[PDB]
């Protein structure tokens, strides 16, 4: 029914701007938060009011009690967490509810439930979703790992159960690599995610990363919005994403999409979320993780379905019914998203600290840009290296590639190194154009790293 | 029918970038031209090669012999003229033909035929198109004007028959005004178009400006892409354009659209062109002029139909067949374009000459930006004041207005005065939101000029 009067965006950069835009289109006043080093940030200038908080640049966005209190002081009725920072923090979501503030996301018990990677696999198994073979929970000790490895069969995978962003993932091809990499990844988790909890699963060979988008309202209406292929990756982090995948047929799209919809109804999911799968070389999908939040790559799904995911998050959070049924969801054409990161591909994607000098954003038919940058934007060590997301749409796959290549060739950024020259070479690459890429794509195509300056 | 290997773009600014992008997506090499004062122009950076020519800033783009000669010297097979400059210059289009260069546009004989408004009305009249009552042809002298005025009935409008861009037009509400305005519109047209000849037509009070987009191939297959409402104007030049119009029902859309197709086929039109109509209070359309070229506002039509008009221009000029029938052309949703000009609306829209300092381009779902600017872009007195075209799309009219208001509120440009604050107020105005605008809109809503600076 009634829309929020005021929403506080507990995030920064391009996802803050994305949420602020959806709010402005809905007529909601907005509140930004920022650290002193970002007094000139774009999200600060776009919001109707903005507040400088935190004792360091991360504490600005990670201090739940302070952010909830600021919400109350200024009269914000809801909080959008974006992605990262506190978006999948169940204590933050629960604190909002206790205080009368609507968290724009799923219910906090669902966040808690799906926040442990092992537990969410067990939940999805019981709901009928095929999952990657592995441990059924945390690993007690490395003896337990030595056993189960033998059970699943090498090569296996060690994964931080409280992990994210690609951190805490080490492959193990024998029990000698296992024990070493066990200490290697364990210490790495106590210090990185707060919990040393490691799980184990089968390493699937030459895999593709396939993920389904769900969207549900507070009245049990859940739909899926098709899938994305996010296989091109560095440090187990996505670089290029496409929708729909090229792998799946329309009939498999609807089948797997019905399974995730069924499972999301079972756990009582509403708002936006995504179920991530690994596709084996035979093309069978196994569930690995759920993100109970918007994802970076949500725009490619919006471009082929016509559905504004972030704006539906906010409407849903205010109690609006989801005005679609599944039969209404069509998958028109193809969309590609490239992450423009401030890092240097030829030096192992080392971050590129500095200041943007020249900056020209392309535009045109079928081009969308998600960004928060201008000349003078400083790349700092504190935050994700993402500068912009370039997104294109076309009716045919090959036109979408050509459109993306031509958009990247016109995207001028100087003062820091970026991924743009690498991405241009990927668009020119025969295999990519033919649809042949796994998660090992960069490893198997070293010539995409050959470019000038 | 092979595609061109190389195209020369005989233009600048946003339209040269728009054409260059279409060429890159098609795999065509591009050639830019520029004046020494614009050596940092974006169209020069985007092209594969660029040539500094001309003895002053306009001669760069208006010297037909030098441009055609350059195209021959570098092996360009085709020239795209954009809009303005030589795009409706029959001599340029015919010089291209004599030299074996393909002009991307309609045949030079149709350009010459429709280059005089009086003759164009007579041609449309004989083809079945309703026209504005007035003189049958050009006026021989003022003394003839007085006679035909009394016949048609005041109020009447004098117009330069060799006219474009809004110059040479005068409302006359009595014989005293007619005699004054004749000499003034005559002298203005001589200085402005080389030819002082005037026509007279009935002044339609409170009109809307409704225009139909046509697209034809060289094999006689002509379609229409519906209409646009371009009523919001200053100095008789468009500022805000929407598609479709809100005025016409789907049945009038196809009726008036069938008439323009029929007339286009009769004169053997191909490539892109536009037929402009005035609509009276009772909802009836009268033809006033044809533009035998792409127009500034073509993107709103691309957003509701999905047809890439510039890319089709280029394919048509190469001899491809048009891959559409009239039945394929759907009109999905609503699109609005706002011209972001470097001018001060509070001072009569006088051009604002200076250098862009702060510059941030908005992006998002349903937003397209056509622009050639960056920090340091210099607005010179020699060229049009257009900085950027902001285009939005939505399924419903009200969401399109909200989306445009929100995009405009986040478009940061400092260093020069622009139309952005005025445009924001139009989007907030109740009359505009309800569809109630005529070409008198800006004179009748002084409140849209109220804003802080
Ligand atoms: N079982 C697996 N087999 C092969 N590759 C995997 C497997 N599990 C994860 N990966 C790779 O690790 C990348 C990210 O793993 P994820 O489990 O999604 O960890 P994060 O929580 O850091 O996203 C995946 O995109 C995929 O490329
Ligand atoms: N569980 C998490 N806790 C904290 N930050 C996270 C978590 N998961 C992801 N992030 C951060 O969220 C941001 C984006 O996630 P990324 O993996 O880059 O794209 P996706 O939206 O596809 O997961 C990155 O900065 C990543 O490190
Ligand atoms: N007969 C008319 N009655 C009322 N307004 C007119 C009439 N003819 C032209 N106009 C107005 O003047 C504008 C300029 O008309 P046009 O003939 O299209 O001149 P230009 O060639 O400079 O476009 C039109 O958009 C419309 O606003
Ligand atoms: N017949 C013409 N001859 C020369 N320049 C023209 C002519 N018609 C329009 N122009 C110029 O072309 C450019 C854009 O045309 P405008 O009238 O601004 O939008 P549209 O494409 O709707 O005409 C402006 O600089 C205008 O002055
Ligand atoms: Mg993941
Ligand atoms: Mg006109």
């Amino acid at each position: 029914h009634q829309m929020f009067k005021k929403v506080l965006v507990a995030n920064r950069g391009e996802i803050a701007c994305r949420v602020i835009r959806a709010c402005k289109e809905l007529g909601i006043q907005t509140v930004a938060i920022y650290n002193e080093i970002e007094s000139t940030a774009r999200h600060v200038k776009m919001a109707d009011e903005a507040y400088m908080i935190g004792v360091n640049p991360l504490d600005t966005y990670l201090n739940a009690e302070r952010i909830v209190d600021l919400a109350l002081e200024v009269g914000a009725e809801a909080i959008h967490p974006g992605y990262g920072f506190l978006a999948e923090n169940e204590h933050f979501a629960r604190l909002c509810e206790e205080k009368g503030i609507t968290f724009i996301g799923p219910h906090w018990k669902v966040i808690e439930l799906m926040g442990d990677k092992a537990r969410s696999k067990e939940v999805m198994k019981r709901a009928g979703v095929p999952t990657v073979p592995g441990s059924d929970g945390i690993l007690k000790d490395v003896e337990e790992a030595k056993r189960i490895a033998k059970e699943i069969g090498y090569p296996v995978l060690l994964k931080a159960s409280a992990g994210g962003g690609g951190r805490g993932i080490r492959i193990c091809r024998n029990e000698e690599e296992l024990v070493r990499n066990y200490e290697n990844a364990y210490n790495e988790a106590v210090k990185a995610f707060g919990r040393g909890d490691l799980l184990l699963e089968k390493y699937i060979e030459n895999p593709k990363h396939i993920e389904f988008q769900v969207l549900g309202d507070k009245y049990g209406n859940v739909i899926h919005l098709g899938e994305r292929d996010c296989s091109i990756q560095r440090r187990n982090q996505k670089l290029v994403e496409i929708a729909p995948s090229l792998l799946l047929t329309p009939e498999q799209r609807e089948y797997y999409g019905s399974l995730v919809v069924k499972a999301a109804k079972e756990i009582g999911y509403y708002s936006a979320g995504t179920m991530e799968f690994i596709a084996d070389e035979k093309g069978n999908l196994y569930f690995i993780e759920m993100n109970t939040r918007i994802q970076v790559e949500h725009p490619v799904t919006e471009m082929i379905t016509g559905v504004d995911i972030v704006k539906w998050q906010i409407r849903i959070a205010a109690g609006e019914r989801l005005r679609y049924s599944q039969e209404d969801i069509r998958f028109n054409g193809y969309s590609i998203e490239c992450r423009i990161n401030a890092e240097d591909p030829k030096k192992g994607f080392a971050p590129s600290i500095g200041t943007i000098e020249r900056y020209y954003v392309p535009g045109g038919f079928g081009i969308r840009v998600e960004h928060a940058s201008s000349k003078g934007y400083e790349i700092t060590p504190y935050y994700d290296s993402l500068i912009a997301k370039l997104i294109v749409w076309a009716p045919l796959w090959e036109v979408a590639v050509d459109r993306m290549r031509s958009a990247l060739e016109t995207y001028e950024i100087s003062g820091v190194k970026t991924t743009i020259p690498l991405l241009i070479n990927i668009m020119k690459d025969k295999d990519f154009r033919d649809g042949k890429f796994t998660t090992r794509y960069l490893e198997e195509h070293p010539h995409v790293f050959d470019y000038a300056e």
Side-chain angles (χ1 to χ4, degrees), chain A residues 117 132 157 159 163-166 169 201-205 207 209 230-231 233 236 238 276 278 288-289 291 439:
Chain A
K117 223 183 279 174
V132 172
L157 206 55
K159 304 173 75 167
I169 295 170
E201 63 185 27
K202 179 72 188 170
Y203 170 79
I204 298 166
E205 297 267 2
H209 178 119
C230 309
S231 303
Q233 301 177 184
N236 310 126
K238 305 157 183 163
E276 300 195 348
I278 297 291
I288 53 169
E289 88 171 354
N291 291 137
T439 64

mmCIF file of all heavy atoms in Angstrom, chain A residues 117 132 157 159 163-167 169 201-205 207 209 230-231 233 236 238 276 278 288-289 291 439, ligand 1, unseen atoms left out:
data_model
loop_
_atom_site.group_PDB
_atom_site.id
_atom_site.type_symbol
_atom_site.label_atom_id
_atom_site.label_comp_id
_atom_site.label_asym_id
_atom_site.label_seq_id
_atom_site.Cartn_x
_atom_site.Cartn_y
_atom_site.Cartn_z
ATOM 1 N N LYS A 117 27.416 -21.840 4.852
ATOM 2 C CA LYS A 117 27.407 -22.430 3.525
ATOM 3 C C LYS A 117 27.015 -23.899 3.609
ATOM 4 O O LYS A 117 26.228 -24.379 2.785
ATOM 5 C CB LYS A 117 28.765 -22.254 2.844
ATOM 6 C CG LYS A 117 28.600 -21.832 1.380
ATOM 7 C CD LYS A 117 29.932 -21.716 0.610
ATOM 8 C CE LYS A 117 30.629 -20.393 0.879
ATOM 9 N NZ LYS A 117 31.994 -20.340 0.246
ATOM 10 N N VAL A 132 26.278 -30.150 -4.543
ATOM 11 C CA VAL A 132 27.619 -30.716 -4.778
ATOM 12 C C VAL A 132 27.961 -31.690 -3.655
ATOM 13 O O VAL A 132 27.927 -31.298 -2.473
ATOM 14 C CB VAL A 132 28.669 -29.601 -4.856
ATOM 15 C CG1 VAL A 132 30.078 -30.209 -4.906
ATOM 16 C CG2 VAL A 132 28.408 -28.678 -6.091
ATOM 17 N N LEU A 157 37.613 -29.843 -2.489
ATOM 18 C CA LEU A 157 37.677 -28.400 -2.333
ATOM 19 C C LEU A 157 37.508 -28.073 -0.864
ATOM 20 O O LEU A 157 36.602 -28.596 -0.219
ATOM 21 C CB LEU A 157 36.573 -27.737 -3.169
ATOM 22 C CG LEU A 157 36.875 -26.312 -3.611
ATOM 23 C CD1 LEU A 157 38.187 -26.284 -4.360
ATOM 24 C CD2 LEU A 157 35.779 -25.796 -4.484
ATOM 25 N N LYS A 159 36.441 -25.008 1.524
ATOM 26 C CA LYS A 159 35.748 -23.734 1.422
ATOM 27 C C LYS A 159 35.370 -23.212 2.794
ATOM 28 O O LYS A 159 34.795 -23.935 3.609
ATOM 29 C CB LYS A 159 34.482 -23.857 0.575
ATOM 30 C CG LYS A 159 34.736 -24.407 -0.800
ATOM 31 C CD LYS A 159 33.453 -24.671 -1.554
ATOM 32 C CE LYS A 159 32.820 -23.390 -2.060
ATOM 33 N NZ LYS A 159 31.741 -23.650 -3.060
ATOM 34 N N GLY A 163 32.241 -17.767 4.289
ATOM 35 C CA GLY A 163 33.063 -17.051 3.345
ATOM 36 C C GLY A 163 32.254 -16.273 2.324
ATOM 37 O O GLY A 163 31.023 -16.299 2.286
ATOM 38 N N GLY A 164 32.985 -15.574 1.470
ATOM 39 C CA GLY A 164 32.368 -14.764 0.444
ATOM 40 C C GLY A 164 33.426 -14.005 -0.322
ATOM 41 O O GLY A 164 34.550 -13.806 0.159
ATOM 42 N N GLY A 165 33.038 -13.575 -1.524
ATOM 43 C CA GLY A 165 33.922 -12.818 -2.389
ATOM 44 C C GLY A 165 35.072 -13.578 -3.012
ATOM 45 O O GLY A 165 35.907 -12.966 -3.678
ATOM 46 N N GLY A 166 35.132 -14.894 -2.860
ATOM 47 C CA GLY A 166 36.206 -15.677 -3.423
ATOM 48 C C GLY A 166 37.287 -15.995 -2.430
ATOM 49 O O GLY A 166 38.215 -16.739 -2.760
ATOM 50 N N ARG A 167 37.198 -15.471 -1.224
ATOM 51 C CA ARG A 167 38.230 -15.697 -0.229
ATOM 52 C C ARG A 167 38.001 -16.993 0.548
ATOM 53 O O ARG A 167 36.859 -17.416 0.785
ATOM 54 C CB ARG A 167 38.294 -14.529 0.765
ATOM 55 N N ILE A 169 39.205 -20.208 -0.371
ATOM 56 C CA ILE A 169 38.892 -21.367 -1.225
ATOM 57 C C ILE A 169 40.209 -21.924 -1.763
ATOM 58 O O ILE A 169 40.916 -21.246 -2.524
ATOM 59 C CB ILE A 169 37.939 -21.004 -2.375
ATOM 60 C CG1 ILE A 169 36.576 -20.581 -1.804
ATOM 61 C CG2 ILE A 169 37.718 -22.156 -3.293
ATOM 62 C CD1 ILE A 169 35.611 -19.966 -2.766
ATOM 63 N N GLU A 201 33.902 -30.122 -0.345
ATOM 64 C CA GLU A 201 33.040 -30.644 -1.396
ATOM 65 C C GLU A 201 33.903 -31.107 -2.561
ATOM 66 O O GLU A 201 35.114 -30.891 -2.593
ATOM 67 C CB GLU A 201 31.995 -29.599 -1.831
ATOM 68 C CG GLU A 201 32.540 -28.340 -2.453
ATOM 69 C CD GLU A 201 31.440 -27.303 -2.753
ATOM 70 O OE1 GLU A 201 30.387 -27.296 -2.061
ATOM 71 O OE2 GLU A 201 31.636 -26.493 -3.689
ATOM 72 N N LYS A 202 33.261 -31.800 -3.490
ATOM 73 C CA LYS A 202 33.933 -32.276 -4.690
ATOM 74 C C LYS A 202 34.354 -31.071 -5.525
ATOM 75 O O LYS A 202 33.584 -30.125 -5.683
ATOM 76 C CB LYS A 202 32.982 -33.188 -5.473
ATOM 77 C CG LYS A 202 33.502 -33.774 -6.782
ATOM 78 C CD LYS A 202 34.555 -34.855 -6.561
ATOM 79 C CE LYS A 202 35.176 -35.276 -7.891
ATOM 80 N NZ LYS A 202 36.371 -36.157 -7.746
ATOM 81 N N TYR A 203 35.582 -31.089 -6.038
ATOM 82 C CA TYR A 203 35.968 -30.109 -7.047
ATOM 83 C C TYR A 203 35.483 -30.623 -8.392
ATOM 84 O O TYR A 203 35.864 -31.718 -8.807
ATOM 85 C CB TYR A 203 37.479 -29.858 -7.090
ATOM 86 C CG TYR A 203 37.871 -29.011 -8.302
ATOM 87 C CD1 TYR A 203 37.688 -27.617 -8.308
ATOM 88 C CD2 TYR A 203 38.403 -29.601 -9.448
ATOM 89 C CE1 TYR A 203 38.027 -26.833 -9.440
ATOM 90 C CE2 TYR A 203 38.747 -28.833 -10.575
ATOM 91 C CZ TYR A 203 38.556 -27.451 -10.566
ATOM 92 O OH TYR A 203 38.889 -26.690 -11.676
ATOM 93 N N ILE A 204 34.623 -29.855 -9.060
ATOM 94 C CA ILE A 204 34.100 -30.253 -10.362
ATOM 95 C C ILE A 204 34.992 -29.661 -11.439
ATOM 96 O O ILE A 204 35.400 -28.495 -11.357
ATOM 97 C CB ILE A 204 32.634 -29.823 -10.534
ATOM 98 C CG1 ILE A 204 31.761 -30.520 -9.483
ATOM 99 C CG2 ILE A 204 32.161 -30.137 -11.923
ATOM 100 C CD1 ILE A 204 30.390 -29.928 -9.347
ATOM 101 N N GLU A 205 35.308 -30.474 -12.441
ATOM 102 C CA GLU A 205 36.354 -30.162 -13.408
ATOM 103 C C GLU A 205 35.766 -29.361 -14.564
ATOM 104 O O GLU A 205 34.701 -29.702 -15.093
ATOM 105 C CB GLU A 205 36.991 -31.455 -13.937
ATOM 106 C CG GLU A 205 37.689 -32.287 -12.872
ATOM 107 C CD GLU A 205 39.167 -31.974 -12.750
ATOM 108 O OE1 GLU A 205 39.651 -31.081 -13.478
ATOM 109 O OE2 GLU A 205 39.843 -32.610 -11.909
ATOM 110 N N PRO A 207 34.353 -26.378 -14.683
ATOM 111 C CA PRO A 207 32.973 -26.032 -14.339
ATOM 112 C C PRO A 207 32.518 -24.716 -14.971
ATOM 113 O O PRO A 207 33.324 -23.884 -15.395
ATOM 114 C CB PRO A 207 33.036 -25.924 -12.817
ATOM 115 C CG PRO A 207 34.371 -25.459 -12.542
ATOM 116 C CD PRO A 207 35.290 -26.043 -13.602
ATOM 117 N N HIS A 209 29.693 -21.536 -13.916
ATOM 118 C CA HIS A 209 28.969 -20.968 -12.788
ATOM 119 C C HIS A 209 27.650 -20.402 -13.294
ATOM 120 O O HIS A 209 27.632 -19.450 -14.085
ATOM 121 C CB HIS A 209 29.842 -19.910 -12.105
ATOM 122 C CG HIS A 209 29.183 -19.226 -10.944
ATOM 123 N ND1 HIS A 209 29.697 -19.280 -9.664
ATOM 124 C CD2 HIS A 209 28.071 -18.460 -10.868
ATOM 125 C CE1 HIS A 209 28.911 -18.602 -8.845
ATOM 126 N NE2 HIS A 209 27.923 -18.082 -9.555
ATOM 127 N N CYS A 230 28.175 -16.665 -15.065
ATOM 128 C CA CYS A 230 29.201 -15.834 -14.455
ATOM 129 C C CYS A 230 30.508 -16.598 -14.364
ATOM 130 O O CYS A 230 31.218 -16.501 -13.379
ATOM 131 C CB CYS A 230 28.768 -15.366 -13.056
ATOM 132 S SG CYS A 230 27.106 -14.632 -13.081
ATOM 133 N N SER A 231 30.863 -17.344 -15.422
ATOM 134 C CA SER A 231 32.012 -18.255 -15.373
ATOM 135 C C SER A 231 33.374 -17.541 -15.483
ATOM 136 O O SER A 231 34.366 -17.995 -14.895
ATOM 137 C CB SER A 231 31.856 -19.317 -16.470
ATOM 138 O OG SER A 231 30.619 -20.027 -16.303
ATOM 139 N N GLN A 233 36.179 -15.436 -14.523
ATOM 140 C CA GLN A 233 36.481 -15.098 -13.153
ATOM 141 C C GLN A 233 37.983 -14.977 -12.943
ATOM 142 O O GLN A 233 38.781 -15.589 -13.654
ATOM 143 C CB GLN A 233 35.935 -16.159 -12.186
ATOM 144 C CG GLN A 233 34.405 -16.347 -12.272
ATOM 145 C CD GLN A 233 33.884 -17.481 -11.351
ATOM 146 O OE1 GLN A 233 32.671 -17.815 -11.345
ATOM 147 N NE2 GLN A 233 34.720 -17.847 -10.408
ATOM 148 N N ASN A 236 38.560 -16.305 -8.236
ATOM 149 C CA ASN A 236 37.246 -16.849 -7.907
ATOM 150 C C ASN A 236 36.194 -15.759 -7.728
ATOM 151 O O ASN A 236 35.192 -15.984 -7.026
ATOM 152 C CB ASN A 236 37.286 -17.711 -6.645
ATOM 153 C CG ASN A 236 38.382 -18.735 -6.672
ATOM 154 O OD1 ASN A 236 39.201 -18.788 -5.750
ATOM 155 N ND2 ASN A 236 38.400 -19.562 -7.688
ATOM 156 N N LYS A 238 33.856 -12.695 -10.033
ATOM 157 C CA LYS A 238 33.321 -12.598 -11.385
ATOM 158 C C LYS A 238 33.843 -11.334 -12.066
ATOM 159 O O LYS A 238 34.056 -10.310 -11.410
ATOM 160 C CB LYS A 238 31.811 -12.608 -11.342
ATOM 161 C CG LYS A 238 31.264 -13.826 -10.611
ATOM 162 C CD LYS A 238 29.864 -13.493 -10.114
ATOM 163 C CE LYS A 238 29.247 -14.611 -9.310
ATOM 164 N NZ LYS A 238 28.086 -14.075 -8.535
ATOM 165 N N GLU A 276 23.214 -20.029 -6.528
ATOM 166 C CA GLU A 276 24.343 -20.292 -7.356
ATOM 167 C C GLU A 276 24.561 -21.793 -7.594
ATOM 168 O O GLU A 276 24.470 -22.543 -6.669
ATOM 169 C CB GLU A 276 25.580 -19.669 -6.723
ATOM 170 C CG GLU A 276 25.442 -18.154 -6.562
ATOM 171 C CD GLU A 276 26.722 -17.405 -6.275
ATOM 172 O OE1 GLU A 276 27.719 -17.995 -5.972
ATOM 173 O OE2 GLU A 276 26.745 -16.202 -6.362
ATOM 174 N N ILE A 278 26.995 -24.903 -9.817
ATOM 175 C CA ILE A 278 28.094 -25.322 -10.678
ATOM 176 C C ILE A 278 27.503 -26.268 -11.714
ATOM 177 O O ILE A 278 26.705 -27.150 -11.364
ATOM 178 C CB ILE A 278 29.221 -25.989 -9.882
ATOM 179 C CG1 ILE A 278 29.811 -24.992 -8.900
ATOM 180 C CG2 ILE A 278 30.276 -26.485 -10.830
ATOM 181 C CD1 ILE A 278 30.586 -23.878 -9.597
ATOM 182 N N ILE A 288 25.626 -24.673 -4.923
ATOM 183 C CA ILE A 288 26.762 -24.413 -4.045
ATOM 184 C C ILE A 288 26.464 -23.331 -3.009
ATOM 185 O O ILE A 288 26.980 -23.395 -1.892
ATOM 186 C CB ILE A 288 28.047 -24.042 -4.832
ATOM 187 C CG1 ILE A 288 27.779 -22.880 -5.800
ATOM 188 C CG2 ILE A 288 28.624 -25.291 -5.610
ATOM 189 C CD1 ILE A 288 29.069 -22.292 -6.411
ATOM 190 N N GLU A 289 25.699 -22.293 -3.353
ATOM 191 C CA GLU A 289 25.485 -21.265 -2.334
ATOM 192 C C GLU A 289 24.318 -20.377 -2.698
ATOM 193 O O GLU A 289 23.883 -20.319 -3.845
ATOM 194 C CB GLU A 289 26.745 -20.404 -2.064
ATOM 195 C CG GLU A 289 26.968 -19.168 -2.933
ATOM 196 C CD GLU A 289 28.137 -18.248 -2.428
ATOM 197 O OE1 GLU A 289 28.706 -18.494 -1.346
ATOM 198 O OE2 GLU A 289 28.511 -17.283 -3.128
ATOM 199 N N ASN A 291 22.936 -16.348 -2.152
ATOM 200 C CA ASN A 291 23.130 -14.988 -1.670
ATOM 201 C C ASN A 291 21.768 -14.407 -1.376
ATOM 202 O O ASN A 291 20.923 -14.279 -2.267
ATOM 203 C CB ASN A 291 23.909 -14.139 -2.674
ATOM 204 C CG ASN A 291 25.372 -14.573 -2.805
ATOM 205 O OD1 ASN A 291 25.900 -14.642 -3.900
ATOM 206 N ND2 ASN A 291 26.024 -14.862 -1.678
ATOM 207 N N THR A 439 35.156 -21.645 -15.913
ATOM 208 C CA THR A 439 35.812 -20.828 -14.893
ATOM 209 C C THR A 439 37.320 -20.759 -15.069
ATOM 210 O O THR A 439 37.948 -19.872 -14.498
ATOM 211 C CB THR A 439 35.561 -21.348 -13.483
ATOM 212 O OG1 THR A 439 36.160 -22.642 -13.379
ATOM 213 C CG2 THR A 439 34.069 -21.445 -13.234
HETATM 214 N N1 LIG C 1 32.557 -27.406 -6.132
HETATM 215 C C1 LIG C 1 33.191 -26.521 -6.988
HETATM 216 N N2 LIG C 1 33.800 -27.020 -8.102
HETATM 217 C C2 LIG C 1 34.446 -26.094 -8.917
HETATM 218 N N3 LIG C 1 34.573 -24.768 -8.825
HETATM 219 C C3 LIG C 1 33.939 -24.294 -7.696
HETATM 220 C C4 LIG C 1 33.227 -25.130 -6.734
HETATM 221 N N4 LIG C 1 32.707 -24.360 -5.689
HETATM 222 C C5 LIG C 1 33.077 -23.064 -6.007
HETATM 223 N N5 LIG C 1 33.845 -22.994 -7.220
HETATM 224 C C6 LIG C 1 34.394 -21.775 -7.879
HETATM 225 O O1 LIG C 1 34.537 -20.888 -6.759
HETATM 226 C C7 LIG C 1 33.896 -19.756 -7.179
HETATM 227 C C8 LIG C 1 33.177 -19.092 -6.095
HETATM 228 O O2 LIG C 1 32.808 -20.119 -5.079
HETATM 229 P P1 LIG C 1 31.472 -19.580 -3.903
HETATM 230 O O3 LIG C 1 31.236 -20.972 -3.360
HETATM 231 O O4 LIG C 1 30.405 -18.974 -4.758
HETATM 232 O O5 LIG C 1 32.448 -18.916 -2.888
HETATM 233 P P2 LIG C 1 32.088 -17.139 -2.646
HETATM 234 O O6 LIG C 1 31.151 -17.334 -1.447
HETATM 235 O O7 LIG C 1 33.453 -16.614 -2.331
HETATM 236 O O8 LIG C 1 31.293 -16.801 -3.890
HETATM 237 C C9 LIG C 1 32.672 -20.183 -8.010
HETATM 238 O O9 LIG C 1 32.174 -19.220 -8.821
HETATM 239 C C10 LIG C 1 33.315 -21.255 -8.849
HETATM 240 O O10 LIG C 1 33.988 -20.741 -9.983
#
